[PDB]
Design a protein around this ligand. Sequence first.
Ligand SMILES: *[C@@H]1O[C@H](CO)[C@@H](O[C@@H]2O[C@H](CO)[C@@H](O[C@@H]3O[C@H](CO[C@H]4O[C@H](CO)[C@@H](O)[C@H](O[C@H]5O[C@H](CO)[C@@H](O)[C@H](O)[C@@H]5O)[C@@H]4O)[C@@H](O)[C@H](O[C@H]4O[C@H](CO)[C@@H](O)[C@H](O)[C@@H]4O[C@H]4O[C@H](CO)[C@@H](O)[C@H](O)[C@@H]4O)[C@@H]3O)[C@H](O)[C@H]2NC(C)=O)[C@H](O)[C@H]1NC(C)=O
Ligand SMILES: *[C@@H]1O[C@H](CO)[C@@H](O)[C@H](O)[C@H]1NC(C)=O
Ligand SMILES: [Cu+2]
Length: 162
Amino acid sequence: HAVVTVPTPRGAGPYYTQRCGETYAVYMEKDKAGPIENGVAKAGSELGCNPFLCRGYQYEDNEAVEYEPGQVIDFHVDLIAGHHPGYANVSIVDLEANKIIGDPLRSWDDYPNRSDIDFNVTIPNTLGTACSTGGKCAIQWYWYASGNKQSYESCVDFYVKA
Ligand SMILES: *[C@@H]1O[C@H](CO)[C@@H](O[C@@H]2O[C@H](CO)[C@@H](O[C@@H]3O[C@H](CO[C@H]4O[C@H](CO)[C@@H](O)[C@H](O[C@H]5O[C@H](CO)[C@@H](O)[C@H](O)[C@@H]5O)[C@@H]4O)[C@@H](O)[C@H](O[C@H]4O[C@H](CO)[C@@H](O)[C@H](O)[C@@H]4O[C@H]4O[C@H](CO)[C@@H](O)[C@H](O)[C@@H]4O)[C@@H]3O)[C@H](O)[C@H]2NC(C)=O)[C@H](O)[C@H]1NC(C)=O
Ligand SMILES: *[C@@H]1O[C@H](CO)[C@@H](O)[C@H](O)[C@H]1NC(C)=O
Ligand SMILES: [Cu+2]
């Protein structure tokens, strides 16, 4: 059980409830640190979002922050319950394709272990126009608890002027 608290990641809003459905939205907001699979299972055929992209949180409910190439961003992860074994990465995802841009900004082969709950990441110089405006990219923190086959996600929407 864990979730990013800094920077402020995407949270619930109207499009979230509309697109994921009441069952997913209500189950997943009773514990913002819970894994995704349990919400998918409860929702069954009601589910209408991709809960493996930003936990199903939606761009239109949130606002993208402006970052400069080479800028360093401090992350804090509120860790309610550690699970072993497992791995994590923090990467820039292209929201339209659901594919990572370039390399992971940070990778752990064993997560959690404190360079795991309090860490930073650097914006590349190599992004081009790919993140030029809001809603094209986000920084996704992703943790897979292999022991429990549990997925944890948080997103930070951002743009870099190209
Ligand atoms: C580093 O962190 C990153 C994140 O930043 C991690 O990457 C993520 O890892 C997860 C887990 O692997 C990925 O989620 C999974 O994605 C699966 C692959 O699918 C995509 O393929 C194509 C082309 O890209 C798309 O078209 C697909 O989209 C379609 O489906 C989605 C919804 O799934 C729709 O919204 C679209 O409209 C498309 O039609 C995919 O994006 C995906 O299969 C998988 O979901 C299956 O599994 C879950 C349960 O686990 C089910 O709820 C769901 O129904 C899916 O089930 C299908 O497949 C299984 C077989 O596995 C069958 O049993 C089912 O019956 C059914 O056919 C899940 O969404 C995530 O996308 C990926 N994120 C990235 C890359 O950004 C890295 O792993 C991590 N790495 C390290 C080292 O840390
Ligand atoms: C970023 O993380 C490294 C690794 O902990 C740390 O030592 C470094 O000083 C941090 N940089 C900033 C600017 O906070
Ligand atoms: Cu947990």
